[PDB]
Design a protein around this ligand. Structure first.
Ligand SMILES: *Cc1c(COP(=O)(O)O)cnc(C)c1O
Ligand SMILES: O=P(O)(O)OC[C@@H](O)CO
Lengths: 416, 241
């Protein structure tokens, strides 16, 4: 059962081209790169810039990983193959198995460990849906630290269930834009009805941590996060090996890009598999309308400039969509890999992903996260192409979370 | 022995103090000089070197370079960002060559201009200039190995994202990652201001050290004599190998 990796894998040393580094803005009044040393736990920052191919997972972190149910299951979806009358075999790494219901726990656990080891005793972060907020509240609870979550205001109101779990673990949850940070009140001044965005909530979390000498935990985009997530892809390889299977098509959904890069990068770096499909929302068209430029992860501009596919730091998501994947940019490594042609990208609209989920609910049984139904949707379309081609394609996809706390979302999608 | 590579901003803090510092650096063990040409965007420079560019704003660098060149026997590399000159690359290189500089280090060559690496490296070598190629942990292992075969004089490897800012980073481990890939001399830089930070890299395989921000800080805190001092100290440490 030590299919659980001994190391995290960083793809950077194996990339086709160099990965442009984070960067202070031209003629900036303060150094963002220098500010990182206040924002991030020292060892998180060290892993973000001490780029090696492999990095030992501290044994205490491996122990915690095991205690939440790692390695996650690698299921075969045989009923689904039969329903699609496809000759392909369909497998999914089920990241919904962790207590929080998503893969985000994989980076919250080490980050929290490193902060507790450094003497931190209060962490802060943002969240949209609440998958990341819940991960961080559980991880903080594990290491006896307080947590403050800045939740995007509109999500705060439509998703009280996740708030309950975060508060249940011991977190305090505010609705960004709040008036607890300078950047919050600024946004309330100009439009006090503003429904928030991940970029705005990120900035208040960072501002709030600085103002109080807390630390900030980062849930996607940065390389240290996709490094931590590489437990997903490494287990999958080992688990496919146990089956004598070889992946052909690897599919993942993309918000900021951590579950995809955690899932596919061990495959890409070592030269396993062939065809990687990052799947995103048409209502947040990072890939179809985004722009590959240096830009801030957060909206205030408190983090360094980072080279990524982005709709723009001050992007505000569509008002009625309920499918997730609302963050405005893509991880720099993922952005590089897709611009360089190594990863394929695909966007789906809400109806398509909603139908995909019902297919999965009705022919596999797990209620998937709306996020993950983007991947399911591509899985289904590929299973059908393997049909009209007749080849035993093995499609492995990453089911990044369950949808049990997203039932209000599925109700909203009965409007299609 | 080990190479001590000393960076200073052209004209900093003023023309006659700069000349002072350089001369002292060279006399106290600097093997190579890298001299900064004030750019429009010091992309990969920390706040200390960015401020040092503001102070020398307006400097006429060419007559100055000719003064320095006249007395300094050591190799001198112009350091500046390719983005600011790519549209006038031939004239730029020809002016670098006119004022008798040995070569050039474009920090953003590999990172923002990778598709033109071979072309631009030919243009530079063709004109008889050393192309000192810049790398970091952001560059993949294979490419590091490739440019180590073409970089002139030494291959530069910066261990931190930006100069000056002391990002927590394991220098020992980044050097081991690349030591066997670099078929060259391997000069390490970015934030190597503490003996410990400097001795770590030497004993891990590095053939030399590059240092800049700590000199500017010294010049600003205590002055040029007190900074030439620091060169002596650093030369001493490298001399233990
Ligand atoms: C947050 C989330 C995502 C999108 O973020 P990534 O960084 O791409 O993983 C996808 N699926 C689930 C279940 C999420 O919680
Ligand atoms: O030692 P650093 O960090 O100031 O490096 C200076 C650079 O501009 C070139 O070495």
């Amino acid at each position: 059962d030590e299919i659980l990796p001994k190391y995290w894998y960083n793809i950077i040393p194996d990339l086709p081209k160099p990965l442009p580094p984070p960067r202070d803005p031209q003629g900036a009044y303060f150094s963002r790169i220098d500010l990182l040393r206040s924002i991030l736990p020292k060892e998180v920052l060290r892993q973000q810039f001490t780029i090696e191919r492999y990095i030992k997972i501290p044994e205490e972190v491996r122990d915690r990983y095991l205690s939440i149910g790692r390695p996650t299951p690698l299921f075969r979806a045989k009923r689904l193959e039969e329903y699609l009358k496809t000759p392909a075999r369909i497998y999914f790494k089920y990241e919904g198995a962790t207590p929080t219901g998503s893969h985000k726990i994989n980076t919250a656990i080490p980050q929290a460990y490193f902060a507790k080891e450094e003497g931190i005793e209060h962490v802060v972060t943002e969240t949209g849906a609440g998958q990341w907020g819940t991960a961080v509240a559980l991880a903080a609870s594990m290491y006896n630290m307080k947590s403050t979550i800045f939740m995007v205001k509109v999500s705060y109101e439509q998703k009280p269930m996740r708030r309950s779990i975060m508060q249940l673990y011991g977190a305090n949850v505010y609705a960004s834009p709040t008036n607890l940070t300078e950047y919050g009140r600024k946004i309330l001044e100009t439009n006090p009805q503003h429904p928030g965005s991940l970029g705005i909530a990120m900035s208040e979390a960072i501002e709030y941590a600085l103002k109080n000498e807390f630390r900030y935990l980062v849930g996607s985009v940065l390389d240290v996060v996709l490094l931590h997530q590489s437990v997903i892809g490494q287990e999958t390889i080992t688990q496919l090996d146990l089956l004598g299977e070889d992946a052909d098509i690897l599919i993942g959904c993309v918000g900021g890009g951590s579950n995809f890069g955690g899932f596919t990068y061990p495959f890409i770096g070592n030269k396993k598999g062939k065809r990687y499909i990052a799947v995103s929302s048409a209502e947040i068209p990072k890939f179809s309308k985004g722009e590959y430029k240096y830009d801030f992860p957060d909206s205030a501009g408190l983090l360094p400039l980072v080279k990524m596919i982005t709709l723009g730091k001050d992007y505000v998501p569509p008002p009625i969509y309920a499918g997730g994947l609302r963050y405005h940019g893509v991880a720099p490594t993922l952005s590089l890999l897709t611009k360089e042609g190594i990863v394929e990208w695909r966007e789906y609209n809400e109806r398509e992903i909603f139908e995909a989920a019902k297919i999965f609910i009705e022919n596999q049984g797990i209620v998937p996260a709306p996020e993950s139904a983007h991947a399911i949707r591509a899985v289904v379309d590929e299973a059908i192409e393997a049909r009209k081609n007749n080849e035993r394609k093995v499609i492995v996809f990453n089911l990044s979370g369950h949808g049990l706390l997203d039932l209000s979302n599925y109700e909203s999608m009965m409007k299609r | 022995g080990k190479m001590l590579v000393v960076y200073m901003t052209l004209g900093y803090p003023n023309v006659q103090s700069f000349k002072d510092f350089i001369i002292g650096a060279v006399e106290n063990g600097a093997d190579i000089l890298e001299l900064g040409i004030p750019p429009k965007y010091a992309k990969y420079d920390g706040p200390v070197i960015r401020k040092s560019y503001d102070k020398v704003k307006g400097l006429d660098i060419w007559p100055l370079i000719e003064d320095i060149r006249k007395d300094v026997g050591v190799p001198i590399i112009a350091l500046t960002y390719l983005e600011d000159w790519v549209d006038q690359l031939e004239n730029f290189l020809n002016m670098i060559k006119d004022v008798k500089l040995d070569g050039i280090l474009f920090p953003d060559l590999l990172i923002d201009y990778i598709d033109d690496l071979d072309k631009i490296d030919g243009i530079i070598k063709n004109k008889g200039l050393k192309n000192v190629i810049f790398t970091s942990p952001s560059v993949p292992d294979l490419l590091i190995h490739k440019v180590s075969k073409i970089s002139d004089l030494f291959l530069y490897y910066g261990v931190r994202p930006t100069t000056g800012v002391p990002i927590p980073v394991s220098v020992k481990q980044l050097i081991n990652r690349v030591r066997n890939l670099v078929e060259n001399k391997l000069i390490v830089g970015f934030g190597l201001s503490s003996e410990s930070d400097l001795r770590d890299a030497l004993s891990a395989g590095a053939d030399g050290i590059a240092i800049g921000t700590v000199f500017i800080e010294e010049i600003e805190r205590n002055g040029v004599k007190s900074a030439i001092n620091l060169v002596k100290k650093f030369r001493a440490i490298l001399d233990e190998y």
